[PDB]
C-alpha cells in the first residue's frame, strides 16, 4: 500500500524556531476503516525557502547535506552539544573539518525509494524528525531508535 | 407475444471515486461528492441530461481544490438519453 | 433551490428526439420510486458524521424530482439485499418509468460495507449483486427504463492524489 | 513547481459486452462490435465526440438482431469532451 | 470512407468550448500513438477466425485518425504487459495529445487473456493492469489527455439474451 | 451457470413429418473457451401452430398433455405400437381410456424450474426428443435413459 501522510505547504520562521503548517483538513473524514495513521511527511516546494545544499567529503560515508533557512541573517540548523539550535551567518563555503553541525547524512527511505531523511554528522545516533505540537508542526530532533510519541519523520522529496 | 431482450441494459452507476481511491466527506456539511452532485442537479438538470450532469460533476472535480477526489461512471449500459425533466 | 424546467422544452424535445431519449409518462398516473440508503452508526467503524445532512439534501432533491423516496438506515448486508429486493418488487414500478438508487456508506472496491463489517468478518454488498437484482431477469417491472445508481463510498485504501512537476 | 493531481483520470473503456455476457464474432466480416464501431466512427465522428459515438454504437445494439449483446462503457474517468477531429 | 470535419468549424469549436473539451495540438508536429492487439492463433482455444479482417479495418480507421498504429498479435500475458509498458514509455508520447488501446481476444469478466490460457493454467491480463500501467503515476507522459481503451472479449459465458413476453 | 442452448423460432410440417428451424447463425462464434454445447431447446411462440391441450385423469399420475399440429386436417402425435406417427384424427373431446396415444405426461426440468419435457402415456419408458438431422431438426422419439447422439431434449416454455 502506497501510504502518504502530512503534506506541508509553506510556513516561515517565528522566534528563532521553525514552524510548518499542513493543508486544510476542515474536519474532512475518509470512508475507509479508520487507519489513516501517519508515518512520514515529505511534500513541499509548492512554489519559506528551506536551503538544502550538498557537500563532498574526503571520507566518504554518505552524502553530506546542509540545512539552512533565510532570515535577515541566514540561519543554519545545528546539533552542537547534543542540543537543537539555529545558528545564524553562513557556512564558510566548503567546510574543512568533517565534524561540523552544518553537514548531515541523507539515508534512503523504504517508502517508494524516493524520499530521504537526515542524520546528524556532529553526533552518532541522532535523527531529524517533526512531531505534532499544539496547532502547527515542530521540527524537533528525536532519536529514531526510540518510539517517542507518534515518531513522525521529516523527509523531503528529491529533485527529479 | 414473446421476443428477445438483453439481460442487462439501461444501467448506470456513478461511483464516488476512482477505483483504489478514498471518498471524503465534510463532517459539518455532508459529503463533498454528494453536495456537488446536488448543486449540479439543482442548477443543470433543466438543460442537460443525466450523463451530462454527471460530466459536469466530474469536471467540477477536475482541478483538486484542497484535497483530491474524482467520481467515475461505471457499467454504463444506457442506450438513450435520460432527461429528468423536473416539474413535467 | 432547484431550477424548474419550462414547459417549452418538454414539448420541444420528445417530438424531435423520440428514438434517442427515454419516454416520459403523464404526471398524474406516474408513480416514480427511489431508494435512499445510508449507514451512520456502525459496530466496528467510525460514524459518518454529517450523513444526516446528506440524507435530507438528497431526499429534498429527489422529492423535487417527483420520487416517492424510501429512506433506510443501518441495515446489514442481508437487510441490504432484502430491502433492495423489496424495493424492486414494489407494484408501483409498473406505473413507474425510472428509478434512483442512492447509496452512501463505508466500502471497498468490491462493494459497500454494512453495519457489522470487520477486517476479520467481511460484510459488504457487491456491485454485482445490486446490478443483478435490478436487471431484466430478476425485476421484470423495470424493463427498458433507466436504473440510475448513486454510490458514496470508498473503493481503496490508497489516497487518490499525487504530486507531479509541470 | 509541484502541484496536486489525481492518480487516475481521463480514462474510458468501451467493453464489448455487459458483465457476465458473451461477445459474438463473424468469421466472414469480422467481429460485429468492431464492424459497427468502424461504421459509427466513419459516419458520426465529424459531428459527434467520442462519448456521442459510443452512445450511437450502443443505441445501434438496442433491438437484438440475431444474437443479442450490448457494449458498455466501464471505468469512465473522463472530465472533458473528446473530439477526434478527423484530419482537422 | 470517413467524413472530414471542415476547418472553420474546427476553429469555431475550440474557442467556444475551450474548458469543456480536451486540447488539440498542431497537425504537422504531432505524433499520436495507438496500439492494436489481435491474437488469433492460440494453444487451447478455437482460433478467432475473421480477426484479421478486423485488424485491417481498425488500422485503416486509426490511420485515418492520424495514429502511428503499432500492431501486435499472439502475445503471452507477460508479453501483453511488456508490450503495453513499452508502448507507454515511448518518447513520442510527449508530443502526443491522445491515445487508443484497441484490444481483441478471448477473455473472462476479469480481463482479456493471452495465447496460453488453460483451465488448469489460468493466464489473463486484468483491466486493472491496463488502468494501472496507463495511469498518471506509471506513465507521467500521458497527463491530462484521454486514454481510450477499446476491448472485445467474453465475460461470463452467459448469453446476453432473454425471452420475455409483453 | 444458467446454460442455454438452441431455441428454434417457427417452421411447418412437410410430408407428414414435423420440421423445426432455428435462428440464423451465419458462422457466428463466441469469444469464450469453446463449450457452447446444446442440452435443452425450449423457445417458441414468436408471434405452424403446434396445438397443446391439457387433460385431467381419473387416475392422477401427472398432468396429461396432448400435442397436435394444424394442417388441412388436424394431425395428432402418436406412439402406437412403439413407433412414431402422425394421425390426422382430432381428439374425441375428453378421452375416456387412460391408455391413449393422444395424452402425454409432463415432467419438470432441473433447468430453472420453468421448462417441462413430455412423456408417452401409451408406453412406459419412452421419451420425446428432437435430434439434429441434416439441415433442419427432426422430432424423433428417443429413449432418455440411453445417451444417443447428442441427446437433445425437446422442452416447451410454459405460460407465465
Coordinates of N, CA, C and O in Angstrom, one line a residue, chain E:
Chain E
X1 N -16.0 5.4 -46.8 CA -15.0 6.4 -46.4 C -15.2 6.9 -45.0 O -16.0 6.4 -44.2
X2 N -14.5 8.0 -44.7 CA -14.6 8.7 -43.4 C -14.8 10.2 -43.6 O -14.1 10.8 -44.4
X3 N -15.8 10.7 -43.0 CA -16.1 12.2 -43.2 C -15.1 13.0 -42.5 O -14.6 12.7 -41.4
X4 N -14.8 14.1 -43.2 CA -13.8 15.1 -42.7 C -14.4 16.3 -42.1 O -15.3 16.9 -42.8
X5 N -14.0 16.7 -40.9 CA -14.6 18.0 -40.4 C -14.0 19.2 -41.0 O -12.8 19.3 -41.2
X6 N -14.8 20.1 -41.4 CA -14.3 21.4 -42.1 C -13.5 22.2 -41.1 O -13.6 22.1 -39.9
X7 N -12.5 23.0 -41.7 CA -11.5 23.7 -40.9 C -12.2 24.8 -40.0 O -11.8 25.0 -38.8
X8 N -13.1 25.6 -40.6 CA -13.6 26.7 -39.9 C -14.5 26.2 -38.7 O -14.5 26.9 -37.6
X9 N -15.2 25.1 -38.8 CA -15.9 24.5 -37.7 C -14.9 24.1 -36.6 O -15.2 24.2 -35.4
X10 N -13.8 23.5 -37.0 CA -12.7 23.2 -36.1 C -12.3 24.4 -35.3 O -12.3 24.3 -34.0
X11 N -12.0 25.5 -35.9 CA -11.6 26.7 -35.2 C -12.7 27.2 -34.4 O -12.4 27.8 -33.3
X12 N -13.9 27.1 -34.8 CA -15.1 27.6 -34.0 C -15.3 26.8 -32.7 O -15.6 27.4 -31.7
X13 N -15.1 25.5 -32.8 CA -15.4 24.6 -31.6 C -14.5 24.9 -30.5 O -15.0 25.0 -29.3
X14 N -13.2 24.9 -30.7 CA -12.2 25.0 -29.6 C -12.4 26.4 -28.9 O -12.3 26.4 -27.6
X15 N -12.6 27.5 -29.6 CA -12.7 28.8 -29.0 C -14.0 28.8 -28.1 O -13.9 29.4 -27.0
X16 N -15.1 28.3 -28.5 CA -16.3 28.3 -27.8 C -16.4 27.3 -26.7 O -17.3 27.4 -25.8
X17 N -15.6 26.3 -26.7 CA -15.6 25.2 -25.7 C -14.2 24.8 -25.2 O -13.8 23.7 -25.1
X18 N -13.4 25.8 -24.9 CA -12.0 25.6 -24.5 C -11.9 24.8 -23.3 O -11.1 23.8 -23.2
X19 N -12.7 25.1 -22.2 CA -12.6 24.4 -21.0 C -13.6 23.2 -20.9 O -13.6 22.5 -19.9
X20 N -14.4 23.0 -21.9 CA -15.2 21.8 -22.0 C -14.6 20.6 -22.7 O -15.0 19.5 -22.4
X21 N -13.6 20.9 -23.6 CA -13.1 19.8 -24.4 C -11.6 19.8 -24.2 O -10.9 20.7 -23.6
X22 N -11.0 18.6 -24.6 CA -9.5 18.5 -24.5 C -8.7 19.3 -25.5 O -9.3 19.6 -26.5
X23 N -7.5 19.6 -25.2 CA -6.7 20.4 -26.2 C -6.2 19.7 -27.4 O -5.9 18.5 -27.3
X24 N -6.2 20.3 -28.6 CA -5.7 19.7 -29.8 C -4.4 20.4 -30.3 O -4.4 21.6 -30.4
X25 N -3.4 19.6 -30.5 CA -2.1 20.2 -30.9 C -2.0 20.4 -32.4 O -2.9 19.9 -33.2
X26 N -1.0 21.0 -32.9 CA -0.8 21.3 -34.3 C -0.6 20.1 -35.1 O 0.0 19.1 -34.7
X27 N -1.1 20.1 -36.4 CA -1.1 18.9 -37.2 C 0.3 18.4 -37.5 O 0.6 17.3 -37.4
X28 N 1.2 19.3 -38.0 CA 2.5 18.9 -38.6 C 3.3 18.3 -37.5 O 4.0 17.3 -37.7
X29 N 3.4 19.0 -36.3 CA 4.2 18.5 -35.2 C 3.3 17.8 -34.2 O 2.9 18.4 -33.2
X30 N 2.9 16.6 -34.4 CA 2.1 15.8 -33.5 C 2.3 14.3 -33.8 O 1.9 13.9 -34.9
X31 N 2.8 13.6 -32.9 CA 3.0 12.1 -33.0 C 2.1 11.4 -32.1 O 2.4 11.0 -31.0
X32 N 0.8 11.2 -32.6 CA -0.1 10.4 -31.8 C 0.2 8.9 -32.0 O 0.5 8.4 -33.1
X33 N 0.0 8.1 -30.9 CA 0.4 6.7 -30.9 C -0.8 5.9 -30.4 O -1.4 6.2 -29.4
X34 N -1.1 4.8 -31.2 CA -2.2 3.9 -30.8 C -1.7 2.5 -30.9 O -0.7 2.2 -31.6
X35 N -2.3 1.6 -30.1 CA -1.9 0.2 -30.0 C -3.0 -0.7 -30.4 O -4.1 -0.5 -29.8
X36 N -2.8 -1.6 -31.3 CA -3.8 -2.6 -31.7 C -3.3 -4.0 -31.5 O -2.2 -4.3 -32.1
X37 N -4.0 -4.8 -30.7 CA -3.6 -6.2 -30.5 C -4.8 -7.1 -30.9 O -5.9 -6.9 -30.4
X38 N -4.5 -8.2 -31.6 CA -5.5 -9.2 -32.0 C -4.8 -10.5 -32.2 O -4.2 -10.8 -33.2
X39 N -4.7 -11.3 -31.1 CA -4.2 -12.6 -31.2 C -5.2 -13.6 -31.7 O -6.3 -13.7 -31.1
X40 N -4.9 -14.3 -32.8 CA -5.8 -15.2 -33.5 C -5.5 -16.7 -33.3 O -6.4 -17.5 -33.1
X41 N -4.2 -17.0 -33.3 CA -3.7 -18.4 -33.0 C -3.5 -18.6 -31.6 O -2.8 -17.8 -30.9
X42 N -4.1 -19.6 -31.0 CA -4.0 -19.9 -29.6 C -3.4 -21.3 -29.4 O -3.0 -22.0 -30.4
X43 N -3.3 -21.8 -28.2 CA -2.8 -23.1 -27.9 C -3.9 -24.0 -27.3 O -3.7 -25.3 -27.3
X44 N -5.0 -23.5 -26.7 CA -6.0 -24.3 -26.1 C -7.4 -23.8 -26.5 O -8.4 -24.4 -26.0
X45 N -7.5 -22.8 -27.3 CA -8.8 -22.2 -27.6 C -9.0 -22.1 -29.1 O -8.0 -22.1 -29.9
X46 N -10.3 -22.2 -29.6 CA -10.6 -22.2 -31.0 C -10.1 -20.8 -31.6 O -10.2 -19.8 -31.0
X47 N -9.5 -20.8 -32.9 CA -8.9 -19.6 -33.5 C -10.0 -18.6 -33.7 O -11.2 -18.9 -34.0
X48 N -9.6 -17.3 -33.6 CA -10.5 -16.2 -33.8 C -10.6 -15.9 -35.3 O -10.0 -14.9 -35.8
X49 N -11.3 -16.8 -36.1 CA -11.4 -16.6 -37.5 C -12.1 -15.3 -37.8 O -13.2 -15.0 -37.2
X50 N -11.6 -14.5 -38.7 CA -12.1 -13.2 -39.1 C -11.5 -12.1 -38.3 O -11.8 -10.9 -38.6
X51 N -10.6 -12.3 -37.3 CA -10.0 -11.3 -36.6 C -9.0 -10.5 -37.5 O -8.9 -9.2 -37.4
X52 N -8.4 -11.1 -38.5 CA -7.5 -10.4 -39.4 C -8.3 -9.4 -40.3 O -7.8 -8.4 -40.7
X53 N -9.6 -9.7 -40.5 CA -10.4 -8.7 -41.2 C -10.7 -7.5 -40.4 O -10.8 -6.4 -40.9
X54 N -10.8 -7.7 -39.0 CA -11.0 -6.6 -38.1 C -9.7 -5.7 -38.0 O -9.7 -4.5 -37.8
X55 N -8.5 -6.4 -38.0 CA -7.3 -5.7 -37.9 C -7.1 -4.7 -38.9 O -6.8 -3.5 -38.7
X56 N -7.4 -5.0 -40.2 CA -7.2 -4.1 -41.3 C -8.2 -2.9 -41.2 O -7.7 -1.8 -41.4
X57 N -9.4 -3.2 -40.8 CA -10.4 -2.1 -40.7 C -10.0 -1.1 -39.6 O -10.1 0.1 -39.7
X58 N -9.6 -1.7 -38.4 CA -9.3 -0.9 -37.3 C -8.0 0.0 -37.6 O -8.0 1.2 -37.4
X59 N -7.0 -0.7 -38.2 CA -5.8 0.0 -38.6 C -6.1 1.2 -39.6 O -5.5 2.3 -39.4
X60 N -6.9 0.9 -40.6 CA -7.2 1.9 -41.6 C -8.0 3.1 -40.9 O -7.7 4.2 -41.2
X61 N -8.9 2.8 -40.0 CA -9.7 3.8 -39.3 C -8.7 4.7 -38.5 O -8.8 5.9 -38.5
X62 N -7.9 4.0 -37.7 CA -7.0 4.8 -36.8 C -6.0 5.6 -37.6 O -5.6 6.7 -37.2
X63 N -5.5 5.1 -38.7 CA -4.6 5.8 -39.6 C -5.3 7.0 -40.2 O -4.7 8.1 -40.3
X64 N -6.6 6.8 -40.5 CA -7.4 8.0 -40.9 C -7.6 9.0 -39.8 O -7.8 10.2 -40.1
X65 N -7.5 8.6 -38.5 CA -7.5 9.5 -37.4 C -6.1 9.9 -37.0 O -5.9 10.5 -36.0
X66 N -5.1 9.7 -37.9 CA -3.7 10.1 -37.7 C -3.1 9.5 -36.4 O -2.7 10.2 -35.5
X67 N -3.0 8.2 -36.4 CA -2.4 7.5 -35.3 C -1.3 6.6 -35.9 O -1.6 5.8 -36.8
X68 N -0.1 6.7 -35.3 CA 1.0 5.8 -35.7 C 0.8 4.4 -35.1 O 1.3 4.1 -34.0
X69 N -0.1 3.6 -35.7 CA -0.6 2.4 -35.1 C 0.6 1.3 -35.1 O 1.2 1.1 -36.1
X70 N 0.8 0.7 -33.9 CA 1.6 -0.4 -33.8 C 0.7 -1.6 -33.6 O -0.1 -1.7 -32.7
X71 N 0.9 -2.6 -34.4 CA 0.0 -3.8 -34.5 C 0.8 -5.0 -33.9 O 1.9 -5.3 -34.4
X72 N 0.3 -5.7 -32.9 CA 0.9 -6.9 -32.4 C -0.2 -8.0 -32.4 O -1.4 -7.8 -32.5
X73 N 0.3 -9.2 -32.3 CA -0.5 -10.4 -32.4 C 0.2 -11.6 -31.7 O 1.4 -11.7 -31.8
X74 N -0.6 -12.5 -31.1 CA -0.1 -13.7 -30.4 C 0.9 -13.3 -29.4 O 2.1 -13.7 -29.5
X75 N 0.5 -12.6 -28.4 CA 1.3 -12.2 -27.2 C 0.8 -12.9 -26.0 O -0.4 -12.9 -25.7
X76 N 1.8 -13.5 -25.2 CA 1.5 -14.0 -23.9 C 1.1 -12.9 -23.0 O 1.1 -11.7 -23.3
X77 N 0.7 -13.2 -21.7 CA 0.2 -12.2 -20.8 C 1.5 -11.5 -20.3 O 1.4 -10.2 -20.2
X78 N 2.6 -12.2 -20.1 CA 3.8 -11.5 -19.7 C 4.2 -10.5 -20.9 O 4.5 -9.4 -20.6
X79 N 4.2 -11.0 -22.1 CA 4.4 -10.2 -23.3 C 3.3 -9.1 -23.4 O 3.6 -8.1 -24.0
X80 N 2.1 -9.5 -23.0 CA 1.0 -8.5 -23.0 C 1.4 -7.2 -22.2 O 1.3 -6.1 -22.8
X81 N 1.8 -7.4 -21.0 CA 2.2 -6.3 -20.1 C 3.5 -5.7 -20.6 O 3.7 -4.5 -20.5
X82 N 4.4 -6.5 -21.1 CA 5.7 -5.9 -21.6 C 5.5 -5.0 -22.8 O 6.0 -3.9 -22.8
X83 N 4.6 -5.4 -23.7 CA 4.3 -4.6 -24.9 C 3.5 -3.3 -24.5 O 3.8 -2.2 -25.0
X84 N 2.6 -3.5 -23.5 CA 1.8 -2.3 -23.1 C 2.7 -1.3 -22.4 O 2.6 -0.1 -22.7
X85 N 3.6 -1.8 -21.5 CA 4.5 -0.8 -20.8 C 5.5 -0.2 -21.8 O 5.8 1.0 -21.7
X86 N 6.0 -1.0 -22.8 CA 6.9 -0.4 -23.8 C 6.2 0.7 -24.6 O 6.8 1.7 -25.0
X87 N 4.9 0.4 -25.0 CA 4.1 1.5 -25.7 C 3.9 2.7 -24.8 O 3.7 3.8 -25.3
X88 N 3.8 2.5 -23.5 CA 3.5 3.6 -22.5 C 4.7 4.5 -22.4 O 4.5 5.7 -22.3
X89 N 5.9 4.0 -22.5 CA 7.1 4.8 -22.3 C 7.7 5.3 -23.6 O 8.9 5.8 -23.5
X90 N 7.0 5.3 -24.7 CA 7.6 5.7 -25.9 C 7.8 7.2 -25.9 O 7.0 8.0 -25.4
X91 N 9.0 7.7 -26.3 CA 9.3 9.1 -26.2 C 8.4 10.0 -27.1 O 8.3 11.2 -26.8
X92 N 7.7 9.4 -28.1 CA 6.8 10.2 -28.9 C 5.6 10.6 -28.2 O 4.8 11.4 -28.7
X93 N 5.3 10.0 -27.0 CA 4.1 10.3 -26.3 C 4.0 11.8 -25.8 O 3.0 12.3 -25.7
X94 N 5.2 12.3 -25.5 CA 5.2 13.7 -25.1 C 4.7 14.7 -26.1 O 4.0 15.7 -25.8
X95 N 4.9 14.4 -27.4 CA 4.4 15.2 -28.5 C 2.9 14.8 -28.8 O 2.3 15.4 -29.7
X96 N 2.4 13.7 -28.2 CA 1.0 13.3 -28.5 C 0.1 14.0 -27.5 O 0.4 14.6 -26.5
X97 N -1.2 13.9 -27.9 CA -2.3 14.5 -27.1 C -3.4 13.5 -26.8 O -4.5 14.0 -26.3
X98 N -3.3 12.3 -27.3 CA -4.3 11.3 -27.0 C -3.7 9.9 -27.2 O -2.5 9.8 -27.6
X99 N -4.5 8.9 -27.0 CA -4.0 7.5 -27.3 C -5.2 6.6 -27.4 O -6.3 6.9 -26.9
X100 N -5.0 5.5 -28.1 CA -6.1 4.4 -28.3 C -5.5 3.1 -28.0 O -4.4 2.8 -28.4
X101 N -6.2 2.3 -27.2 CA -5.8 0.9 -26.8 C -6.9 0.0 -27.3 O -7.8 -0.3 -26.6
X102 N -6.7 -0.5 -28.6 CA -7.6 -1.4 -29.2 C -7.1 -2.8 -28.9 O -6.1 -3.2 -29.4
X103 N -7.9 -3.6 -28.2 CA -7.6 -5.0 -27.9 C -8.7 -5.9 -28.3 O -9.9 -5.5 -28.2
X104 N -8.4 -7.0 -28.9 CA -9.4 -8.0 -29.2 C -8.8 -9.4 -29.0 O -7.8 -9.7 -29.5
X105 N -9.6 -10.2 -28.3 CA -9.1 -11.6 -27.9 C -10.3 -12.3 -27.2 O -11.4 -11.7 -27.0
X106 N -10.1 -13.5 -26.8 CA -10.9 -14.1 -25.8 C -10.7 -13.5 -24.4 O -9.7 -12.8 -24.2
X107 N -11.6 -13.8 -23.5 CA -11.4 -13.3 -22.2 C -12.6 -13.7 -21.3 O -13.5 -14.4 -21.7
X108 N -12.5 -13.3 -20.0 CA -13.5 -13.5 -19.0 C -13.8 -12.2 -18.3 O -13.4 -11.1 -18.8
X109 N -14.7 -12.2 -17.3 CA -15.0 -11.0 -16.6 C -13.8 -10.3 -16.0 O -13.7 -9.1 -16.0
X110 N -12.8 -11.1 -15.6 CA -11.6 -10.5 -15.0 C -10.8 -9.6 -16.0 O -10.5 -8.5 -15.8
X111 N -10.6 -10.2 -17.2 CA -9.9 -9.4 -18.2 C -9.7 -10.2 -19.5 O -10.2 -11.3 -19.6
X112 N -8.9 -9.6 -20.4 CA -8.5 -10.3 -21.7 C -7.4 -11.3 -21.4 O -6.4 -11.0 -20.7
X113 N -7.5 -12.5 -22.0 CA -6.5 -13.5 -21.9 C -5.5 -13.5 -23.1 O -5.8 -12.9 -24.1
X114 N -4.4 -14.1 -22.9 CA -3.3 -14.2 -23.9 C -3.5 -15.3 -24.8 O -4.6 -15.5 -25.3
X115 N -2.4 -16.1 -25.1 CA -2.5 -17.2 -26.0 C -2.2 -18.5 -25.4 O -2.1 -19.5 -26.1
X116 N -2.1 -18.6 -24.1 CA -1.7 -19.9 -23.4 C -2.8 -20.1 -22.3 O -2.4 -20.8 -21.3
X117 N -4.0 -19.7 -22.5 CA -5.0 -19.9 -21.5 C -5.4 -21.3 -21.3 O -5.6 -22.0 -22.3
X118 N -5.5 -21.8 -20.1 CA -5.8 -23.1 -19.8 C -6.7 -23.1 -18.5 O -6.4 -22.3 -17.6
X119 N -7.6 -24.0 -18.4 CA -8.4 -24.1 -17.2 C -7.6 -24.5 -16.0 O -7.8 -24.0 -14.8
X120 N -6.6 -25.4 -16.2 CA -5.7 -25.7 -15.1 C -4.5 -24.6 -15.0 O -3.9 -24.5 -13.9
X121 N -4.3 -23.9 -16.0 CA -3.2 -22.9 -16.0 C -3.8 -21.6 -16.5 O -3.7 -21.2 -17.7
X122 N -4.5 -20.8 -15.6 CA -5.1 -19.5 -16.0 C -4.0 -18.5 -16.4 O -2.9 -18.5 -15.9
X123 N -4.4 -17.7 -17.4 CA -3.5 -16.7 -18.0 C -4.4 -15.6 -18.6 O -5.0 -15.9 -19.6
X124 N -4.4 -14.5 -18.0 CA -5.3 -13.4 -18.3 C -4.8 -12.1 -17.8 O -4.2 -12.0 -16.7
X125 N -4.9 -11.1 -18.7 CA -4.5 -9.7 -18.3 C -5.7 -8.9 -17.8 O -6.7 -8.9 -18.5
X126 N -5.6 -8.4 -16.6 CA -6.7 -7.7 -16.0 C -6.9 -6.3 -16.5 O -5.9 -5.7 -17.0
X127 N -8.1 -5.8 -16.4 CA -8.3 -4.4 -16.8 C -7.6 -3.5 -15.8 O -7.1 -2.4 -16.2
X128 N -7.6 -3.8 -14.5 CA -6.8 -3.1 -13.5 C -5.4 -2.9 -13.9 O -4.8 -1.9 -13.7
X129 N -4.8 -3.9 -14.5 CA -3.4 -3.8 -15.0 C -3.3 -2.7 -16.1 O -2.3 -2.0 -16.0
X130 N -4.2 -2.7 -17.0 CA -4.1 -1.6 -18.0 C -4.3 -0.3 -17.4 O -3.5 0.6 -17.7
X131 N -5.3 -0.1 -16.6 CA -5.5 1.2 -16.0 C -4.4 1.6 -15.0 O -4.2 2.8 -14.8
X132 N -3.7 0.7 -14.4 CA -2.6 1.0 -13.6 C -1.3 1.3 -14.4 O -0.5 2.2 -14.0
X133 N -1.1 0.6 -15.5 CA 0.0 0.9 -16.4 C -0.1 2.3 -17.0 O 0.8 3.1 -17.1
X134 N -1.4 2.7 -17.4 CA -1.6 3.9 -18.1 C -2.0 5.1 -17.2 O -2.4 6.1 -17.7
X135 N -2.0 4.9 -15.9 CA -2.5 6.0 -15.0 C -1.4 7.1 -15.0 O -0.4 7.1 -15.6
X136 N -1.8 8.1 -14.2 CA -0.9 9.3 -14.1 C 0.4 9.0 -13.3 O 1.3 9.9 -13.3
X137 N 0.5 7.9 -12.6 CA 1.7 7.6 -11.8 C 2.7 6.9 -12.6 O 3.9 7.3 -12.7
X138 N 2.3 5.7 -13.3 CA 3.3 4.9 -14.0 C 3.7 5.6 -15.3 O 4.9 5.6 -15.7
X139 N 2.8 6.2 -16.0 CA 3.0 6.9 -17.3 C 2.7 8.4 -17.1 O 1.6 8.8 -17.3
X140 N 3.7 9.1 -16.6 CA 3.6 10.6 -16.4 C 3.4 11.3 -17.7 O 2.9 12.4 -17.7
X141 N 3.9 10.8 -18.8 CA 3.9 11.4 -20.1 C 2.5 11.5 -20.7 O 2.3 12.2 -21.7
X142 N 1.5 10.9 -20.1 CA 0.1 10.9 -20.6 C -0.8 11.7 -19.7 O -2.0 11.4 -19.6
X143 N -0.3 12.7 -19.1 CA -1.1 13.5 -18.2 C -2.2 14.3 -18.9 O -1.9 14.9 -20.0
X144 N -3.4 14.4 -18.4 CA -4.4 15.4 -18.8 C -4.8 15.2 -20.2 O -5.3 16.2 -20.9
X145 N -4.6 14.0 -20.7 CA -5.1 13.7 -22.1 C -5.8 12.3 -22.1 O -5.5 11.5 -21.2
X146 N -6.9 12.1 -22.9 CA -7.7 10.9 -22.7 C -6.9 9.6 -23.1 O -6.0 9.7 -24.0
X147 N -7.3 8.5 -22.5 CA -6.7 7.2 -22.8 C -7.9 6.3 -23.1 O -8.4 5.6 -22.2
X148 N -8.3 6.2 -24.4 CA -9.4 5.5 -24.8 C -9.0 4.0 -25.0 O -8.0 3.7 -25.7
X149 N -9.7 3.1 -24.3 CA -9.4 1.7 -24.3 C -10.6 1.0 -25.0 O -11.8 1.2 -24.5
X150 N -10.4 0.3 -26.0 CA -11.5 -0.5 -26.8 C -11.1 -1.9 -26.7 O -10.0 -2.3 -27.2
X151 N -12.0 -2.8 -26.2 CA -11.7 -4.2 -26.0 C -12.9 -5.0 -26.6 O -14.0 -4.6 -26.7
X152 N -12.5 -6.3 -26.9 CA -13.5 -7.3 -27.2 C -13.1 -8.6 -26.5 O -12.0 -9.1 -26.7
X153 N -14.0 -9.2 -25.7 CA -13.8 -10.4 -25.1 C -15.1 -10.9 -24.4 O -16.1 -10.1 -24.4
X154 N -15.1 -12.1 -23.9 CA -16.2 -12.6 -23.2 C -16.1 -12.3 -21.7 O -15.0 -11.9 -21.2
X155 N -17.2 -12.4 -21.0 CA -17.1 -12.1 -19.5 C -17.6 -13.2 -18.6 O -17.0 -13.5 -17.6
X156 N -18.7 -13.9 -19.0 CA -19.2 -14.9 -18.1 C -19.8 -16.2 -18.7 O -20.4 -17.0 -18.0
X157 N -19.7 -16.3 -20.0 CA -20.2 -17.5 -20.8 C -21.7 -17.6 -20.7 O -22.3 -18.6 -21.1
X158 N -22.4 -16.5 -20.3 CA -23.9 -16.4 -20.3 C -24.3 -15.6 -21.5 O -23.9 -14.5 -21.7
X159 N -25.2 -16.2 -22.3 CA -25.8 -15.5 -23.5 C -26.5 -14.3 -23.0 O -27.4 -14.4 -22.1
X160 N -26.2 -13.1 -23.6 CA -26.8 -11.9 -23.1 C -28.2 -11.6 -23.7 O -28.5 -10.6 -24.2
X161 N -29.0 -12.7 -23.7 CA -30.4 -12.6 -24.3 C -31.4 -13.2 -23.3 O -31.0 -14.1 -22.5
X162 N -32.6 -12.7 -23.4 CA -33.7 -13.3 -22.6 C -35.0 -13.2 -23.4 O -35.2 -12.2 -24.1
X163 N -35.8 -14.2 -23.3 CA -37.1 -14.3 -24.0 C -38.2 -13.9 -23.0 O -38.5 -14.7 -22.1
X164 N -38.7 -12.7 -23.1 CA -39.7 -12.1 -22.2 C -40.9 -11.7 -23.0 O -40.8 -11.0 -24.0
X165 N -42.1 -12.1 -22.5 CA -43.3 -11.7 -23.2 C -43.8 -10.3 -22.7 O -43.2 -9.7 -21.8
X166 N -44.7 -9.8 -23.5 CA -45.3 -8.4 -23.2 C -44.2 -7.4 -23.3 O -44.0 -6.6 -24.3

